[PDB]
Design goal:
By secondary structure, the chain is mainly beta. It is built from 2 helices and 10 strands. The longest helix has 10 residues. Bound molecules: the ligand C[C@@H]1CN(C(=O)c2cnsn2)[C@@H](C)CO1. The ligand C[C@@H]1CN(C(=O)c2cnsn2)[C@@H](C)CO1 binds next to loops. It is found in: Cell membrane; Cell projection, Microvillus; Secreted.
């Protein structure tokens, strides 16, 4: 009973979280997941400031109100070559990655590793935070509050 959470650097508190190496997070699960990181879904303004500090990914993820990809460099296979905060307009499906915002993080680029999931609750799952440099932090618990997400 294991969940891997791959996380990035933070940029003005905003970071990306991919669960189990595939698009697998619902909107309800995303809010609960950021809450376990003492974080919230970023606002569009918070995401635009993170972008300005150096944040980009090549993966769709929830923010408050939309599903987006922050892009700095145009790449044909990432958000159809767009730059800026690219907003997903048309999709049949409901599961993506998520972004999270931690107000207590540093103001600009923070590429240190994430070493804790401070607000997860008691439960049976081995939850492993996997950093881009491969460093891992694991704990037994749960973060999903909606049964349909389990
Ligand atoms: C990234 C922020 C802070 N954080 C960390 O584990 C951390 C430790 N050192 S740097 N980042 C988690 C609470 C998620 O929200």
């Amino acid at each position: 009973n294991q969940i891997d959470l791959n996380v990035t650097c933070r940029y003005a508190g905003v970071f990306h979280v991919e669960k189990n190496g595939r698009y697998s997070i619902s909107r309800t699960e995303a809010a609960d997941l950021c809450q376990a990181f003492n974080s919230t879904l970023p606002t569009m303004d918070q995401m635009k400031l993170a972008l300005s500090k150096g944040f980009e990914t090549c993966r769709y993820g929830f923010i408050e109100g939309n599903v987006v990809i922050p892009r700095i460099h145009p790449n044909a296979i990432c958000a159809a070559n767009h730059t800026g905060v690219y907003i997903l307009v048309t999709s049949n499906t409901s599961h993506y990655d998520t972004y999270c915002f931690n107000a207590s993080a540093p103001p600009e680029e923070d590429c240190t590793s994430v070493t804790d999931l401070p607000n997860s609750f008691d439960g049976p799952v081995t939850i492993t935070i996997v950093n881009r440099d491969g460093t891992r932090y694991s704990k037994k618990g749960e973060y999903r509050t909606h049964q349909e997400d389990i």
